[PDB]
Ligand binder design. Structure first.
Ligand SMILES: [Mn+2]
Ligand SMILES: [Mn+2]
Ligand SMILES: [Mn+2]
Ligand SMILES: [Mn+2]
Length: 177
DNA sequence: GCCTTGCCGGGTAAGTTCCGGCGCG
DNA sequence: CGCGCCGGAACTTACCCGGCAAGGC
């Protein structure tokens, strides 16, 4: 209930600004990574990490939250086969998210990939199918929107939330838990 | 004249996967 | 022997930002 909401939010940040990596090292070593990157140190240590910690505690993951400071950004990383599959399986069943999870995930995805000036309401991603899934959710919530190829340099698509529904958007999705 | 939204270029804030560790049965 | 958790960081580019303008009222 509370776990899955926080889960879908985190999944949003992950699919947005991180990822789920199954790596094969020399040899034959392996690792399973749950990753969120961000520039803001504060956002990652004060906001995201306590949420990942709760989820880790709640699923008995003996793994730790790593925070690696690279040149351009902070990488929050959990190295854990268990947490990995947890999100990956949730991702596999994304089309089945209930209302709480939908709002949670879109919130997460907006923080990552969204227009922060909020003068325009936009979401970027190369994954058209992902954006399409999000678009259908927004329609069932009374938030009109269109999708179209924004950046031909890189095949990045954009999801544009109609300014007509700005307030229904900002207070239903972004101003939640 | 004003509001909404598609267009399009700048470049940095993201993402992705190497490496060397260490530990487990 | 095969595999799973740490600590990095080099490397590439996919996101965001923001000015412009083409319609719609
Ligand atoms: Mn992304
Ligand atoms: Mn991003
Ligand atoms: Mn981002
Ligand atoms: Mn086009």
């Amino acid at each position: 209930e509370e776990v899955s909401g926080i889960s879908a939010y985190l999944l949003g940040l992950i699919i947005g600004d991180g990822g789920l990596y199954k790596l094969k090292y020399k040899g034959n070593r392996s690792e399973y990574r749950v990753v969120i990157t961000q520039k803001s140190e504060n956002l990652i240590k004060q906001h995201i990490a306590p949420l990942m910690q709760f989820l880790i505690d709640e699923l008995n993951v003996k793994s730790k939250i790593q925070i690696v400071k690279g040149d351009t950004r902070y990488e929050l990383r959990v190295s854990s086969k268990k947490l990995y599959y947890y999100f990956a399986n949730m991702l596999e069943r994304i089309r089945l998210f209930n209302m709480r999870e939908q709002i949670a995930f879109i919130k997460g995805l907006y923080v990552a990939e969204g227009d922060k000036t909020l003068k325009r309401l936009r979401i970027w991603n190369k994954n058209k199918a992902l954006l399409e899934i999000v678009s259908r959710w927004l329609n069932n919530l009374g938030v009109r929107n269109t999708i179209h190829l924004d950046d031909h340099r890189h095949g990045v698509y954009v999801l544009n939330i109609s300014l007509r529904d700005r307030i229904k958007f900002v207070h239903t999705i972004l101003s939640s838990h």
